[PDB]
Amino acid sequence: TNLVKNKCVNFNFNGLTGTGVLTKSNKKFLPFQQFGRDIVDTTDAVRD
């Protein structure tokens, strides 16, 4: 399904399910890692 940003939607990124608002990030990920987590181990960033 097409990507929608700046809107509360139910997302599913390659099996990673959840709900939240998708925005453009300034985080420089590495090619092998896909999604990011904060100190409390919650998903705060993903890759398309």
């Binding site: 100190i39 409390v40 181990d41 919650t42």
Partner: protein, 48 residues
């Protein structure tokens, strides 16, 4: 009869108070410990 001396001593003590707090970081340990305890309790609750 010692008004000027007492005033100078009070001014010097007030001036040294700032040094005893700007140089010593563990002087405010109580408030920092309270904040850290609250934050750590929240982090433990969200990590559970």
């Amino acid at each position: 009869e010692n008004q000027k001396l007492i005033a100078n001593q009070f001014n010097s003590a007030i001036g040294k108070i700032q040094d005893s707090l700007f140089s010593t970081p563990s002087a405010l340990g109580k408030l920092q410990d309270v904040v850290n305890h609250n934050a750590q309790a929240l982090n433990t609750l969200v990590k559970q």
